[PDB]
Design a protein around this ligand. Sequence first.
Ligand SMILES: *[C@@H]1O[C@H](CO[C@@H]2O[C@@H](C)[C@@H](O)[C@@H](O)[C@@H]2O)[C@@H](O[C@@H]2O[C@H](CO)[C@@H](O[C@@H]3O[C@H](CO[C@H]4O[C@H](CO)[C@@H](O)[C@H](O)[C@@H]4O)[C@@H](O)[C@H](O[C@H]4O[C@H](CO)[C@@H](O)[C@H](O)[C@@H]4O)[C@@H]3O)[C@H](O)[C@H]2NC(C)=O)[C@H](O)[C@H]1NC(C)=O
Ligand SMILES: *[C@@H]1O[C@H](CO[C@@H]2O[C@@H](C)[C@@H](O)[C@@H](O)[C@@H]2O)[C@@H](O[C@@H]2O[C@H](CO)[C@@H](O[C@@H]3O[C@H](CO)[C@@H](O)[C@H](O[C@H]4O[C@H](CO)[C@@H](O)[C@H](O)[C@@H]4O)[C@@H]3O)[C@H](O)[C@H]2NC(C)=O)[C@H](O)[C@H]1NC(C)=O
Ligand SMILES: CCCCCCCC/C=C\CCCCCCCC(=O)OC[C@H](COP(=O)(O)OCC[N+](C)(C)C)OC(=O)CCCCCCC/C=C\CCCCCCCC
Ligand SMILES: CCCCCCCC/C=C\CCCCCCCC(=O)OC[C@H](COP(=O)(O)OCC[N+](C)(C)C)OC(=O)CCCCCCC/C=C\CCCCCCCC
Ligand SMILES: CCCCCCCC/C=C\CCCCCCCC(=O)OC[C@H](COP(=O)(O)OCC[N+](C)(C)C)OC(=O)CCCCCCC/C=C\CCCCCCCC
Ligand SMILES: CCCCCCCC/C=C\CCCCCCCC(=O)OC[C@H](COP(=O)(O)OCC[N+](C)(C)C)OC(=O)CCCCCCC/C=C\CCCCCCCC
Ligand SMILES: CCCCCCCC/C=C\CCCCCCCC(=O)OC[C@H](COP(=O)(O)OCC[N+](C)(C)C)OC(=O)CCCCCCC/C=C\CCCCCCCC
Ligand SMILES: CCCCCCCC/C=C\CCCCCCCC(=O)OC[C@H](COP(=O)(O)OCC[N+](C)(C)C)OC(=O)CCCCCCC/C=C\CCCCCCCC
Ligand SMILES: CCCCCCCC/C=C\CCCCCCCC(=O)OC[C@H](COP(=O)(O)OCC[N+](C)(C)C)OC(=O)CCCCCCC/C=C\CCCCCCCC
Ligand SMILES: *[C@@H]1O[C@H](CO)[C@@H](O[C@@H]2O[C@H](CO)[C@@H](O)[C@H](O)[C@H]2NC(C)=O)[C@H](O)[C@H]1NC(C)=O
Ligand SMILES: CC(C)CCC[C@@H](C)[C@H]1CC[C@H]2[C@@H]3CC=C4C[C@@H](O)CC[C@]4(C)[C@H]3CC[C@]12C
Ligand SMILES: CC(C)CCC[C@@H](C)[C@H]1CC[C@H]2[C@@H]3CC=C4C[C@@H](O)CC[C@]4(C)[C@H]3CC[C@]12C
Ligand SMILES: CC(C)CCC[C@@H](C)[C@H]1CC[C@H]2[C@@H]3CC=C4C[C@@H](O)CC[C@]4(C)[C@H]3CC[C@]12C
Ligand SMILES: [Mg+2]
Ligand code: NA
Ligand code: NA
Lengths: 40, 294, 993
Amino acid sequence: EGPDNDERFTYDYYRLRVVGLIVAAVLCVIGIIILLAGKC
Amino acid sequence: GWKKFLWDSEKKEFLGRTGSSWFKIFLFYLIFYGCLAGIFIGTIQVLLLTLSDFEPKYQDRVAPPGLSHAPYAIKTEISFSISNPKSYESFVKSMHKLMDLYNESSQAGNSPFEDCSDTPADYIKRGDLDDSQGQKKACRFSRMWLKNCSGLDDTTYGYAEGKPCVVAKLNRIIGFYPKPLKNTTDLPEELQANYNQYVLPLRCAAKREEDREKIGSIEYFGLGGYAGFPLQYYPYYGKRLQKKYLQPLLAIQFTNLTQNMELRIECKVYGENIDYSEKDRFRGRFEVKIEVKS
Amino acid sequence: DLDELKKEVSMDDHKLSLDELHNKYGTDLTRGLTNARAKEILARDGPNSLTPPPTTPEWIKFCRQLFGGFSILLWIGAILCFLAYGIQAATEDEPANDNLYLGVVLSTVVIVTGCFSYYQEAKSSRIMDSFKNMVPQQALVIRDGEKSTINAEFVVAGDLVEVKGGDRIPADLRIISAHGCKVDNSSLTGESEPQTRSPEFSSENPLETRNIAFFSTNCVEGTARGVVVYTGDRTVMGRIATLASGLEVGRTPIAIEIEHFIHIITGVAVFLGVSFFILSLILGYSWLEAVIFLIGIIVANVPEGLLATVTVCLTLTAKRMARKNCLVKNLEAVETLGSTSTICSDKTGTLTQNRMTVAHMWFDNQIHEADTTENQSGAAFDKTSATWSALSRIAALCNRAVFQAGQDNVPILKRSVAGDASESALLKCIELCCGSVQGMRDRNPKIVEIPFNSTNKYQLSIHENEKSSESRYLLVMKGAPERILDRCSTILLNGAEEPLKEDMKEAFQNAYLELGGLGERVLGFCHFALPEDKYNEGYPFDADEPNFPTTDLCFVGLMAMIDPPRAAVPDAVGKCRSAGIKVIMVTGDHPITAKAIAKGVGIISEGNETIEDIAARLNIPIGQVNPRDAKACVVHGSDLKDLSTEVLDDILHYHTEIVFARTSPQQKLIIVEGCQRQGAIVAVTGDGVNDSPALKKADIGVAMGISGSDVSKQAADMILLDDNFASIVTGVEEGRLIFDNLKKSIAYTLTSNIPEITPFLVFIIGNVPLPLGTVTILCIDLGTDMVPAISLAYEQAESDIMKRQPRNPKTDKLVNERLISMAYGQIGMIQALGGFFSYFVILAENGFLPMDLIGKRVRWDDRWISDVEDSFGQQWTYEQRKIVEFTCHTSFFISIVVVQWADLIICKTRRNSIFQQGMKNKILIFGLFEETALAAFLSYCPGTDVALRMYPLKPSWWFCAFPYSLIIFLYDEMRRFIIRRSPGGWVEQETYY
Ligand SMILES: *[C@@H]1O[C@H](CO[C@@H]2O[C@@H](C)[C@@H](O)[C@@H](O)[C@@H]2O)[C@@H](O[C@@H]2O[C@H](CO)[C@@H](O[C@@H]3O[C@H](CO[C@H]4O[C@H](CO)[C@@H](O)[C@H](O)[C@@H]4O)[C@@H](O)[C@H](O[C@H]4O[C@H](CO)[C@@H](O)[C@H](O)[C@@H]4O)[C@@H]3O)[C@H](O)[C@H]2NC(C)=O)[C@H](O)[C@H]1NC(C)=O
Ligand SMILES: *[C@@H]1O[C@H](CO[C@@H]2O[C@@H](C)[C@@H](O)[C@@H](O)[C@@H]2O)[C@@H](O[C@@H]2O[C@H](CO)[C@@H](O[C@@H]3O[C@H](CO)[C@@H](O)[C@H](O[C@H]4O[C@H](CO)[C@@H](O)[C@H](O)[C@@H]4O)[C@@H]3O)[C@H](O)[C@H]2NC(C)=O)[C@H](O)[C@H]1NC(C)=O
Ligand SMILES: CCCCCCCC/C=C\CCCCCCCC(=O)OC[C@H](COP(=O)(O)OCC[N+](C)(C)C)OC(=O)CCCCCCC/C=C\CCCCCCCC
Ligand SMILES: CCCCCCCC/C=C\CCCCCCCC(=O)OC[C@H](COP(=O)(O)OCC[N+](C)(C)C)OC(=O)CCCCCCC/C=C\CCCCCCCC
Ligand SMILES: CCCCCCCC/C=C\CCCCCCCC(=O)OC[C@H](COP(=O)(O)OCC[N+](C)(C)C)OC(=O)CCCCCCC/C=C\CCCCCCCC
Ligand SMILES: CCCCCCCC/C=C\CCCCCCCC(=O)OC[C@H](COP(=O)(O)OCC[N+](C)(C)C)OC(=O)CCCCCCC/C=C\CCCCCCCC
Ligand SMILES: CCCCCCCC/C=C\CCCCCCCC(=O)OC[C@H](COP(=O)(O)OCC[N+](C)(C)C)OC(=O)CCCCCCC/C=C\CCCCCCCC
Ligand SMILES: CCCCCCCC/C=C\CCCCCCCC(=O)OC[C@H](COP(=O)(O)OCC[N+](C)(C)C)OC(=O)CCCCCCC/C=C\CCCCCCCC
Ligand SMILES: CCCCCCCC/C=C\CCCCCCCC(=O)OC[C@H](COP(=O)(O)OCC[N+](C)(C)C)OC(=O)CCCCCCC/C=C\CCCCCCCC
Ligand SMILES: *[C@@H]1O[C@H](CO)[C@@H](O[C@@H]2O[C@H](CO)[C@@H](O)[C@H](O)[C@H]2NC(C)=O)[C@H](O)[C@H]1NC(C)=O
Ligand SMILES: CC(C)CCC[C@@H](C)[C@H]1CC[C@H]2[C@@H]3CC=C4C[C@@H](O)CC[C@]4(C)[C@H]3CC[C@]12C
Ligand SMILES: CC(C)CCC[C@@H](C)[C@H]1CC[C@H]2[C@@H]3CC=C4C[C@@H](O)CC[C@]4(C)[C@H]3CC[C@]12C
Ligand SMILES: CC(C)CCC[C@@H](C)[C@H]1CC[C@H]2[C@@H]3CC=C4C[C@@H](O)CC[C@]4(C)[C@H]3CC[C@]12C
Ligand SMILES: [Mg+2]
Ligand code: NA
Ligand code: NA
């Protein structure tokens, strides 16, 4: 480390947003499944 | 209704209940809220036990340092009359408040101040961010270094005859090492001359192409006579490990300023770990609207 | 439109003569009026047509829906928001655009809710308009001595009008000459049987006399003449319709509950605003700021999402009713049924079928019962004896009625039959259990028939015998049991014949009194085989001299008949009585029949007795017995006319089974008012026009759809398109279910108010950074929260709802202090603490410890301070600290959702446990999933920190509200436990909503 400690000030917000969106989509799908589970 | 629900004399009821009822409800709520407060306090104590006293866990919201100045402008505008003295008082008061922390009387003895190179130098590492060694030592920054804007000769600092000063300062960040641009063929025009590696350059200009002519001679004052910040005053170890620490400063005199006209002056610092933002107009650079109307 | 002169009982000039009548109105009894005079009167007073109802433009009702009680509260909230914005603009520069967005949002919410409610009421109005079928009708008037058929709108007072069986009485006539003319006074007077109209006068009451024809009545059989006495709106039913239209609407119970709810919400809002205003003034703020703070707090304390939620809840309960054929014109009339505690019903057309049907039959010294139910779902009467066959032959032959051409599609009971009611019932019973009567009649040719005389009181006829081995002649007569009994000497027992000894004569007398006491009309059928030796096959029996032996006949058996009740009438009445609903019969029919129908449907429980019954069982006068020993009472209309208010109050206060007989429509209205005077909700169920003044003034009217009148259908609030009385039970059940669900949904939407207000209060008192932004409160109140609150309506019952007593209106409210103590006092507090916890965590991880946050708002807000030292010594610019504050708003909103999970689960059930009821509500699960997906989408979608100002969160923050949620679940679980184990304890009278 030392002078080149640039990583100490970076955060991968991109990957975080990607994962959060995938999870949100999955939850929405499951919800729809449960809602329509019975009318078919 | 109105009278009865307030006080009846048969059941000896007040507001609806008897004496022992209001007491039962008050006692229940007191115990409930007490437990609520105790639980919240415990959950906050575990938090206090999770953080460290010498370093902020997250330092991503303050990665690109800002660029502030000494005068306190309401809308980033400096307008004052050279005749009425009660016009630039708010400026001098601020300026003075800032420079009043660099008094030599404060910087005295071996502890905790240490004499550093009178000429820009390289970084200085006083160890890690621990409590093993006692309070670290910070380099001394003398007032006199700033030549015509120091409040020692002309208390007003310039505002008295149409020659105001602007003391620029870099935002203090823990463990931040400033890195300047290298001498390679790619570098701005301005930065070519006086390439002291150990100095972070600061250069002001005009926002619009027209205003160029109306702006006179930007005379910068700093450590060693250069227009920048010496790398030796970094890094900053934080308040807990470096109390009584002074950050470099750079004075800027806007000599030969056109009279009775709003001038937009944009100052900007250059460097690798320095990046600007179109949303934050104080990240790395800063804007000032000077108008010496007389 | 004098209402008192319309509230009075109808008067008339019936008690007069033909000369006095012709001398008062002017008219020739044998020549009628002249064309010139007829037109002079036609133009002098107006056509014989009722005035049309008062129309209603669509923008008027749209404006009505845009207003009300809840929408008005939201309107004042929007107005206040714009006022605060104007203030901030006139005093400072750079006014935060918060109040303006909130105001436009509230206005949009009100407009959308109004559009939805209006669309629903319009849907019901269209399906309601598809029922008014009005075909022009022309009457037969005699002018200058000639018969002419002119439009009903051209009949005037004084001309001569002739009617014929099958036509409708145009105006109010005064019969002058009739020929066995019967009329159907069921719609106006409620008389189930056809009353004969005679030119002579008989009763002082115009509705009882036979010399007056009435508007909208139809002549069943016969022809008659008459002078038009009343025409146009001045007719009886004209005054009744005008009175119905000139009545107020009222204010349903659901509306009163919503009103008392708004009252409480405003009380606590103005209390918190004035209190924090005096406190802020005690801490140094200026006037201008205190006014803004006051308006902001009063606006926060208001629920904008509760409106759409309540509207959807009510609409959900309305679609089920529409699935079972129960249509409501308004939207709040769906709950009134559940709160009803006294149902006033009608007999003719509502409790019964208004159709004569063969009820009991006598044969082989044994009473037999026949099925008298619409869909024919019952028990047969043992069709295996020869006696029944002979009876079927007598009834099927000695009968002149025949089904109307083209009825091969309708059922055996609902088809049209041209003839008398008795003959129609007999024909229907024979066609029901004996096959095609047309073949039974063509199988035996009728040779000679002697019509029904008023003196002979018997109908006889001779036909050939279809026996291929016997060419003799058959004679069949039918009539009154006494007359027929005096003409017989044999009895067809089990097929064989036997003498008429006094034993069977006494059994016949007991059978006659048995069928008579049942309120039925009994007839006797007998026949005889004429000896072919004394009357050969060629001899013609002309109806002139005694060609047939009047006596020595063979009596086969009696046949009773009466109008039966609808299929689900007894079961529905029993279900209503089980739920604690007082059933009171109110009808303008004979008391002898009303009492029988009451005992048959359950109004007068078997065993109870009237004062007359006791006097008859003891053989003592009626003035000696005490009226307190009689639970059921039959109040006659004639006696009701001379009764004070206190007497009626006592009648309803001491008798549990009341039956009002021979009551006029005005008296029906008086009865409804007498029931309301005490304090109970009233539901009137009717079908005819006599029920119009009763359906309007009652808290809720139920009109029949097929057998109902247009006036009563337009003046009612609920329509039974299938004429099924069980819909009343279904409605009273749904009204309760949706009430408990409304309570649950209200507590859910109100719990989130505390974690949405406390931040601003601590912001003003403690001077810390704003914890909850305005666009986040908007994303919570109008976003995520909507689906769960809507799902709370689909919750099933916990205990039997059709068992508990009706809710008391003066004590059990919809929103009491027990709810406020939970939402505003215990759950909301925990949610607010969880939000503040996540807040402090986010600010502590970035560098601002809790000790340095108190007292920073002055510099944390300042836009020109680009160097704010934190707990570690770092310098933060303005935009950087603002970004952190916005991230704190995002995390606060997510914490709110996390605690809302446990709030929705603890709000699902009010008393029972979750491990008992069960998570069978799929809508609730879908609500939770969507509530979470929406928060994740609003935070992680790119470009949100620019449009809505919501930054992404770090995976470790999302877990700061979990412990608070589990704690909420545990607290409410143990709460809903002591209530069960300890009924009536502190936890019940303190936290049981
Ligand atoms: C950091 O240094 C500041 C300056 O220090 C001075 O210069 C350095 C190089 C050394 O020589 C040091 O010894 C000097 O003091 C220091 O601020 C100074 O503090 C003194 C003490 O209060 C001030 O003196 C007073 O001046 C006023 C009038 O001031 C006028 O000018 C200033 C600008 O300079 C304006 O801001 C004012 O509004 C006025 O226009 C006198 O009225 C006052 O009278 C008092 O003393 C006399 C005897 O002399 C008595 O008779 C009276 O009753 C009063 O009791 C003082 O003479 C001095 O103005 C001030 N300088 C500035 C620029 O403000 C600062 O405090 C130091 N801070 C730290 C943390 O060390
Ligand atoms: C940072 O960089 C500058 C420029 O470096 C030059 O360009 C870079 C992009 C890269 O290509 C480098 O390799 C390249 O040197 C440094 O300043 C330069 O220094 C030289 C040497 O003094 C100057 O060249 C001089 O030009 C004069 C006329 O303009 C000429 O008269 C000078 O004569 C000298 O040299 C000759 C031999 O060539 C000798 O005979 C003479 O007697 C005399 O010594 C000389 O050629 C450049 O002009 C300078 N550039 C600028 C912009 O001033 C700079 O020193 C460096 N800084 C550090 C700290 O390394
Ligand atoms: C009955 C009801 C059923 C309900 C089911 C709902 C479905 C749930 C759906 C999804 C949940 C799974 C999520 C998994 C996501 C992992 C993704 C991942 O890679 O994530 C990594 C992060 C670490 O982030 P960082 O900051 O360290 O690095 C950041 C580094 N950078 C930013 C530089 C890149 O980690 C994380 O997010 C941690 C993710 C959270 C961990 C899950 C914890 C589960 C908690 C309780 C369940 C226990 C069940 C027990 C079984 C009982 C059976 C009887
Ligand atoms: C019946 C069955 C139904 C099934 C339906 C399934 C639907 C599909 C399900 C999931 C789809 C997943 C799509 C993933 C998209 C990833 C986009 C992404 O990762 O973009 C990130 C970057 C922005 O990063 P930055 O550097 O600006 O960060 C800020 C850095 N700072 C602030 C520090 C400077 O993007 C960019 O640049 C370019 C972005 C371009 C625009 C992409 C649009 C994405 C928006 C919405 C799609 C997500 C919907 C998911 C479904 C949810 C339902 C509720
Ligand atoms: C920065 C700090 C943050 C601060 C945040 C504050 C958030 C505010 C949270 C809650 C607001 C509380 C406001 C008061 C709410 C009271 C509820 C209420 O008014 O509901 C209305 C009920 C009516 O109910 P009903 O329709 O069933 O009646 C039927 C009667 N029938 C049937 C016999 C005719 O009326 C009643 O309950 C009767 C009225 C009783 C009024 C009691 C007033 C108590 C208020 C304060 C006490 C403070 C004392 C503290 C000192 C303690 C000693 C140490
Ligand atoms: C540290 C973290 C703290 C978090 C705190 C917040 C927690 C809130 C979220 C979830 C709480 C779950 C509570 C579990 C309750 C289970 C109760 C249960 O199992 O009672 C069994 C019932 C009773 O049956 P019975 O005897 O009446 O049947 C009779 C059948 N006959 C009539 C044919 C005989 O059986 C039934 O209800 C039928 C089967 C129903 C199965 C339901 C399974 C789904 C459960 C939860 C869904 C997950 C939501 C997650 C939300 C997050 C979204 C991201
Ligand atoms: C059963 C039925 C299922 C139906 C499910 C439907 C789910 C739909 C799922 C996804 C669609 C969502 C909309 C997609 C929006 C894409 C926006 C986008 O791709 O933006 C990309 C660019 C960002 O570019 P940059 O990184 O260079 O910017 C740098 C800016 N610097 C550097 C100055 C800071 O955007 C910009 O520039 C300008 C950003 C414009 C902001 C648009 C956001 C809209 C705001 C509110 C609407 C959300 C309402 C919620 C609806 C919920 C429905 C369930
Ligand atoms: C069924 C489930 C539904 C779920 C949906 C969630 C419901 C949402 C409920 C309420 C949220 C609506 C609140 C509207 C917020 C508007 C904010 C706004 O106008 O901010 C104005 C900003 C100006 O900002 P500045 O001064 O910092 O600019 C400085 C620029 N300098 C410095 C560079 C010069 O301009 C901008 O952001 C420009 C971009 C404009 C973005 C408009 C986004 C509109 C978002 C929603 C409207 C449609 C919602 C309809 C759905 C209803 C659901 C029932
Ligand atoms: C972060 C959020 C944390 C939140 C934690 C909250 C924890 C606090 C929970 C409970 C503390 C309150 C205890 C108050 C006790 C004093 C009340 C009292 O003075 O009561 C007197 C009555 C006895 O009078 P009586 O009825 O015989 O007289 C008849 C009189 N007449 C006619 C009016 C009915 O007392 C009774 O009835 C007995 C009723 C006692 C009340 C039981 C309520 C228990 C509720 C929750 C406990 C579960 C905590 C689980 C947390 C797990 C954390 C992981
Ligand atoms: C400062 O600006 C002034 C102009 O405001 C410059 O002086 C002018 O020079 C021109 C010749 O180019 C003369 O025509 C004017 O009369 C001068 N005006 C004054 C007021 O002197 C001056 O050269 C500038 N000086 C610096 C150091 O920038
Ligand atoms: C039924 C109950 C107990 C289930 C509770 C599930 C909780 C713990 C789940 C639901 C949604 C989940 C989160 C949804 C989104 C994100 C963002 C993603 O980039 C990392 C995971 C993270 C941070 C998840 C953590 C765990 C989480 C909060
Ligand atoms: C289950 C519930 C009711 C228990 C609540 C216990 C409460 C009262 C306990 C839990 C943790 C405790 C705190 C934990 C940490 C500290 C710091 C220490 O230097 C002094 C005590 C102090 C300030 C405690 C005060 C009391 C406290 C908040
Ligand atoms: C932020 C903090 C300090 C505010 C604390 C406010 C507490 C004390 C307030 C909030 C809501 C209030 C309760 C709300 C409801 C009721 C029911 C009513 O019929 C009597 C008053 C009573 C029992 C109140 C007592 C005081 C109470 C619990
Ligand atoms: Mg009727
Ligand atoms: Na009404
Ligand atoms: Na709200």
